[PDB]
Amino acid sequence: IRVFAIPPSFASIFLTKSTKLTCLVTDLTTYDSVTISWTRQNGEAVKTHTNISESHPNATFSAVGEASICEDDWNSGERFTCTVTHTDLPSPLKQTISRPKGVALHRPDVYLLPPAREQLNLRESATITCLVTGFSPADVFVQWMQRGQPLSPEKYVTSAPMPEPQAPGRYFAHSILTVSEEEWNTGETYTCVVAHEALPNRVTERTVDKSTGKPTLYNVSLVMSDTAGT
Amino acid sequence: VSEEEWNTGETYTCVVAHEALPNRVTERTVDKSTGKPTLYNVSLVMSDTAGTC
Amino acid sequence: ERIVLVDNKCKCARITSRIIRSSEDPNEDIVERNIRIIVPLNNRENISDPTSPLRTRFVYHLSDLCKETCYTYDRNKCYTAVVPLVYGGETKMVETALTPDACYPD
Amino acid sequence: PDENFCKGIKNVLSCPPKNSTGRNGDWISVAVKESSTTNKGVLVPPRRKKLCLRNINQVWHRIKDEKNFKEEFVKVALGESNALMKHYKEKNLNALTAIKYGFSDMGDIIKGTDLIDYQITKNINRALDKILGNETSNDKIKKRVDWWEANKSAFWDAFMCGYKVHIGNKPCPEHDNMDRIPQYLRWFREWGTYVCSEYKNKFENVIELCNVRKEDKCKGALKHYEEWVNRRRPEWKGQCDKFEKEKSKYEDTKSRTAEIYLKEICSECDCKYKDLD
Ligand SMILES: *[C@@H]1O[C@H](CO)[C@@H](O[C@@H]2O[C@H](CO)[C@@H](O)[C@H](O)[C@H]2NC(C)=O)[C@H](O)[C@H]1NC(C)=O
Ligand SMILES: *[C@@H]1O[C@H](CO)[C@@H](O)[C@H](O)[C@H]1NC(C)=O
Ligand SMILES: *[C@@H]1O[C@H](CO)[C@@H](O)[C@H](O)[C@H]1NC(C)=O
């Protein structure tokens, strides 16, 4: 019997424009008696869950949660809980979930690090790290794109947010995109997008390629004409 | 004009009127500030901090 | 003491002329143009499009800038673009802030 | 007389502007410390992070005498005086506090007791140790303290040389002898002065908006105030915890709460303290 409640990240708040709470119950026996309504701070509820699957890859029960809470309620930080009606548990389990109140809001800084020259000498794969510094709280959303169209989620892997080594309340996020070396040598522009609540426009973008990220040479054609002027 | 007068800046503005002209006035200007200069120092810095000019 | 004739921001040129005052003599005093033009050296050809390659050839027509995709960003104006974002099957296009301190909410 | 004697001008290298960074510095971001366990919750100012030691970094190895050791710190003190006042000339604020804080920070770097993990600080410490002679750790620390206490006069006179190249006719201020105050208390005072000025500004705004007029702009003002207090609370918690740990070792700090220590002496507006109680 495994149960988890996942807060909606700021990407779910921004991109989907809807706050969806999920309290998933997985790896247990199937009884099909799930009827969960997300309780607000008071006794009333907002909406029931949808799309419960009575099958699992390991032949168990997999449950999900679904609701639609107004964003102003999340800005208020009211405590929400998920209570189970499904019959395997003799007593319902409560998972109190809410947005933390009192946390700081530092704008993240998106930083791109080109692959090392030692790795590029191997000529098989090139790894680029999208290093994010100084965001609070931990919930950060990061995407990788090539020349404007997005990549598959399997191509790039991002690490879980971790506390800053020296800063008191800041956090850092580290994401890597693994691509072939010949693609990096062709000069394709590789860009990173980070979504966070403390950003000015909520989305800031940085671009790196062979010519930008630690280039071997600076090629510049410094042409000028009509120095007489008018 | 006196040669001493031209040395100081008076901007010596030239004004004309003609039929086939949009504003009926074309304003032209010569002074000592504008002209063929004796010295040219074109100074470029190969700056890396961009987007701040 | 120098008159700034033309100060274009994208080309970041500074067309200004100065006159060195000579001693008590007939006039051979030196007229100069104090032009000080700054290169970004790392910006891309399409300044609005982040996905452009590096620009190497910088063409500075001095007569043209007195009175054409432009070179360096200006902190007063915004150079912004739209980037796709995906949370799943859906695709949403969101405007992004390419440079800070220019489009900051004020 | 309460001025300084005519001091010869020495060559000084340029330093990057303090306002060049668009973020204008970050109090919360701390880079390196001696230890964050025994010294926990102490915040480095942007001024300390932007402390320009370019002059001594060039000749920290070629130097062989104490006369040049005094002269070189005069050269960098003049550069700091030019840099700090020019930054505050645009800000239109008194730079005396920044001047004396920078002097005290430089002196603590001379001591080697500055709350920083710079190898530059270690290099200057080794250079000063080889200047005066090598002894045991406590002995060389005490000798360096005595040397700086003896030779701070020229450094401080150079600081008011940079001060009086602008202020001119008005009398020079007094030393105030806060060199016995360590690094962390001075950083506490700087943080308190800065955060009190910002609380003055934000409280003036929130009053002028909400008290007269619930307008949406007033709600935004309250949200900005909430964001700033949420940002600044952990800083206060860490600094107050540090004050509580190093509480008992001086007489001036024998006053129990840290906020009244900030209030009762200097460098504060007597407005807000951010107590959790
Ligand atoms: C490259 O520069 C061109 C200008 O020569 C721009 O292309 C158009 O710019 C206008 C004004 O910003 C937009 O409304 C159009 O949507 C742009 N065209 C396209 C096809 O998007 C733009 O600055 C750059 N082009 C791109 C594609 O970013
Ligand atoms: C370098 O610049 C010159 C002149 O613009 C050009 O002819 C040459 O092809 C460039 N080389 C590379 C590798 O970009
Ligand atoms: C051009 O020369 C004048 C003196 O002739 C000098 O004052 C000025 O600074 C020079 N321009 C630059 C960019 O250095």
| SS3 category, D57 | helix
Give how far B33 is from chain C: nearest CA, Å.
7
Return the sign of the alpha-carbon dihedral for residues C60, C65, C66, C72.
negative
Phi-psi region of C59 (alpha: psi -120 to 50; beta: other; left: phi over 0): beta
- The DSSP secondary-structure symbol of D249 reads G
- Establish whether the linkage from the previous residue to C26 is cis, with ω within 30° of 0: no
User: Contacts from D67-71 at CB under 8 Å and sequence distance 24+?
Assistant: D69/D127, D69/D128, D69/D131, D70/D151, D70/D154, D70/D155, D71/D10
Q: Does C104 touch chain A (CB under 8 A)?
A: yes
- Rounded CA gap, D35 and D41, in Å? 11
As separate numbers, helices (DSSP H) first and strands (DSSP E) second, chain B gives 1, 4
| Domain A105-230 in the same topology as domain A1-100 | yes
DSSP string, C5-72: EE--SSS---EEEEE----SSSS-PPEEE--EEE--SS-BSSSS-TT--B--EEEEEHHHHH----SS
In degrees and rounded to multiples of 5, residue A76 shows phi and psi of -70, -25
The DSSP bridge pattern shows strands C31-33 and A141-146 to be unpaired
The DSSP bridge pattern shows strands B26-29 and B13-16 to be antiparallel
- Topology, domain A1-100: Immunoglobulin-like (2.60.40)
- Rounded CA gap, D75 and D10, in Å? 6
The closest ligand to the CA of C16 turns out to be 3
The DSSP bridge pattern shows strands A125-135 and A171-180 to be antiparallel
Chain breaks of chain D after residues with C–N above 2.5 Å = 213
- Rounded CA gap, D114 and C50, in Å? 44
Q: Does D260 touch chain A (CB under 8 A)?
A: no
Contacts of A63 (CB under 8 A, 6+ apart): A23, A24, A25, A26, A34, A49, A52, A53, A86
Between helix D258-265 and helix D216-245 the angle, nearest 10°, is 100
Half-sphere exposure (Cβ direction) of B19: Cα atoms closer than 13 Å: 0
CB contact under 8 A, A166 and D28: no
Closest alpha carbon to C60 in C33, C37, C34, C43: C37
Output the CA–CA distances (angstroms, integers) from residue D151 to B35, C79, D144, D161, in the order listed. Answer: 58, 54, 10, 16
| Residue ranges making up the domain that contains D80 | 1-277
Q: Which residues pair with A26 in a beta bridge?
A: A2, A62
- Rounded CA gap, D257 and C32, in Å? 65
In degrees and rounded to multiples of 5, residue A135 shows phi and psi of -115, 145
User: Ligand 1 atom 18: the closest Cα is on which residue?
Assistant: C49
Closest alpha carbon to D179 in D201, D152, D161, D203: D152
CA dihedral of residues D11, D14, D15, D19 (deg, nearest 10): 130
Cβ atoms of D58 and D13 within 8 Å: the answer is yes
Between helix D183-206 and helix D258-265 the angle, nearest 10°, is 90
Q: Does C61 touch chain A (CB under 8 A)?
A: yes
Cβ of B41 below 6 Å from ligand 3: yes
Q: Does D230 touch chain A (CB under 8 A)?
A: yes
SS (H, E, C) D142-194: HHHHHHHHHHHHHHHHHHHHHHHHHHCCCCCCCCCCCCCCCHHHHHHHHHHHH
In ligand 1, the atom with minimum distance to the C-alpha of C48 is 23
- Rounded CA gap, D188 and D106, in Å? 17
CATH number belonging to the domain at A105-230, selected among 3.30.230.10, 2.60.40.10, 3.20.20.70, 3.30.70.1400: 2.60.40.10
Q: Does C37 touch chain B (CB under 8 A)?
A: yes
Cβ atoms of A186 and A106 within 8 Å: the answer is no
Q: Which two tokens stand for residue D244?
A: 């509580």
Domain limits, chain A: 1-100, 105-230
Cβ of C36 below 6 Å from ligand 3: yes
Cβ atoms of D230 and A104 within 8 Å: the answer is yes
Which residues in chain B have Cβ-Cβ distances shorter than 8 Å to A205?
none
In ligand 3, the atom with minimum distance to the C-alpha of C35 is 13
CB contact under 8 A, B37 and C43: no
The DSSP bridge pattern shows strands B39-40 and C31-33 to be parallel
Total domains in the fold of chain D: 1
DSSP string, C75-94: SSS--EEEEEEESSS-EEEE
CB contact under 8 A, A218 and B46: yes
